[PDB]
Structure 1
Amino acid sequence: AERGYSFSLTTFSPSGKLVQIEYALAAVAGGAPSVGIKAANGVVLATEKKQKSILYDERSVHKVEPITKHIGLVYSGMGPDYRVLVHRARKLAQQYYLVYQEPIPTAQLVQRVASVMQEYTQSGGVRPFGVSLLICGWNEGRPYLFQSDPSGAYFAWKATAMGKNYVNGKTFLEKRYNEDLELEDAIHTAILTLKESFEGQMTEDNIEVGICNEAGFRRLTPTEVKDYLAAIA
């Protein structure tokens, strides 16, 4: 027989900080890196799918997940927490569509999921999600790229990174690329910004990438991946 803790597990310290949230971000800063680029004609998401042994079947699980026909996700942090948020985003995505009959606007999906993440920083008995997401979408012509973190706060980026070396991965992009970048272009400068930390032999199974153009969102196959890898494609 179970009861429940009704008091919040996150609380302001005298410094005015929300300790658990910072610590959650620490779990993020310690996770596999992720990069997102808004190419003004499609967005790109890519992360380090570092699997320990070769025994791991890279297939069976993904980090770049489709929310709707036109939305997509990637994270940096605790994998299990992510999964929870993926099911809730997909769900939130449907509750919108049933009511409005129009696919959910990317900004709107972000707002909704961010609200959830915020919920877990005040409700009783729980800890904040130890994850940060990068949502990408094509809603009404313009491409979108967003990031919401543990606190439940979100921002729209032209491009960014989260996870290990996200500090360096950002500055790198802070110059190593800019707007007007076309499709395949933003994809290259993305897999590159990734390698700017990717320790090891970055192959087609060490990474996973998805793109979101104004014609749907999808994950790229090991093929199209092995290609871009050869420093081109």
Structure 2
Amino acid sequence: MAERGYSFSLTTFSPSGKLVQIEYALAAVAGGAPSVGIKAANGVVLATEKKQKSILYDERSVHKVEPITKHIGLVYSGMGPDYRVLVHRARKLAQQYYLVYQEPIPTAQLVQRVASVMQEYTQSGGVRPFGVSLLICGWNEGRPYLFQSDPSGAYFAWKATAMGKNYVNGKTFLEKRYNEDLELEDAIHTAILTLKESFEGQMTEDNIEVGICNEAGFRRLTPTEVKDYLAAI
């Protein structure tokens, strides 16, 4: 046994100037389950599909939409255990910020710290980059925020976006459906419709997970609320 990891980078520059490992992590993301984020005028909705491979799976056991703080929520597309690592790190970073400043971390600050961690894994010794893309929602200063953080460590602010399978078509659908001044209920309907575009089979209140962020904070929708929204559609 020897606990020393490799000290050389596994992500290096190709002769054409590209870091191919990050592009392959992006391919892993593009093979993931569809995720949608929509920033309404008074909140953000994050909707993902969780279609289990069997009825033997307990749907309630694992969650893909996760709280980071009382005001920040997370969802991902890509590889789930990498996502768990990043969720744990984001919660710890938010807590450290709260310990220093005694106010909840602004969404942009937490996005920056998480993206910094992802960049570290694009450059440090003996590791591969994370194989996930994160959608991060938050409410700060009476304002909703929606960010996407990629495996390279680059983050973007979005009004509405999609990740995972069929995300190009999802983006086209969003940009031909999204408008400003939208309310949170209509954004929830639009997010569920965007999931429905790429969904295969019947969508039920257990096939999808929905989280919302507004002034009251971030919370996961119970399957009963999701069933009500699906009935409305």
**What residue ranges of structure 2 are gaps of 5+ in the alignment?**
none
Cα shift at 1:179 = 1.3
Q: Map residues 123-134 of structure 1 onto 2, 5 A cutoff.
A: 123-134=124-135
Contact residue 204 and residue 230 of structure 2 kept, 8 A: yes
Instruction: Give the distance between the partners of 1:83 and 1:158, measured in 2 at CA.
Output: 25
**Which residue matches 1:168?**
169
Q: What is the SS of the residue equivalent to 1:88? A: helix
Q: CA RMSD in A?
A: 0.7
Q: What is the SS of the residue equivalent to 1:121? A: helix
| TM-score, normalization by structure 1 | 0.98
Cα shift at 1:23 = 0.2
Cα shift at 1:177 = 2.0
Contact residue 160 and residue 178 of structure 2 kept, 8 A: no
Aligned residues: 232
Cα shift at 1:183 = 1.2
Instruction: Give the distance between the partners of 2:158 and 2:3, measured in 1 at CA.
Output: 43
Instruction: Give the distance between the partners of 2:33 and 2:92, measured in 1 at CA.
Output: 26
**Off by >2 Å, runs of 4+ in structure 1:** none
Contact residue 9 and residue 123 of structure 2 kept, 8 A: yes
Q: What is the SS of the residue equivalent to 1:21? A: helix
Instruction: Give the distance between the partners of 1:133 and 1:40, measured in 2 at CA.
Output: 21
Cα shift at 1:214 = 1.4
Cα shift at 1:165 = 0.3
Instruction: Give the distance between the partners of 1:143 and 1:3, measured in 2 at CA.
Output: 44
Q: What CA deviation, in whole Å up to 9, does each residue of 1:70-128 have, x standing for no partner? A: 00000000000000000000000000001000000000000000000000010000000
Q: What is the SS of the residue equivalent to 2:129? A: coil
**What residue ranges of structure 1 are gaps of 5+ in the alignment?**
none
Cα shift at 1:2 = 2.5
Instruction: Give the distance between the partners of 1:50 and 1:83, measured in 2 at CA.
Output: 18
Q: What is the SS of the residue equivalent to 2:206? A: coil
Instruction: Give the distance between the partners of 1:214 and 1:167, measured in 2 at CA.
Output: 31
Identity %: 100
Instruction: Give the distance between the partners of 2:23 and 2:12, measured in 1 at CA.
Output: 12
Contact residue 42 and residue 214 of structure 2 kept, 8 A: yes
Q: Map residues 1-233 of structure 1 onto 2, 5 A cutoff.
A: 1-232=2-233
Q: What CA deviation, in whole Å up to 9, does each residue of 1:58-79 have, x standing for no partner? A: 0010000000000000000000
Q: What is the SS of the residue equivalent to 2:186? A: helix
Cα shift at 1:162 = 0.3
Instruction: Give the distance between the partners of 2:228 and 2:134, measured in 1 at CA.
Output: 26
Cα shift at 1:230 = 1.4
Instruction: Give the distance between the partners of 1:88 and 1:150, measured in 2 at CA.
Output: 15
Instruction: Give the distance between the partners of 2:96 and 2:4, measured in 1 at CA.
Output: 30
Cα shift at 1:6 = 0.1
Instruction: Give the distance between the partners of 2:181 and 2:149, measured in 1 at CA.
Output: 25
| TM-score, normalization by structure 2 | 0.98
Instruction: Give the distance between the partners of 1:53 and 1:4, measured in 2 at CA.
Output: 38
Instruction: Give the distance between the partners of 2:43 and 2:174, measured in 1 at CA.
Output: 17
Cα shift at 1:40 = 1.7
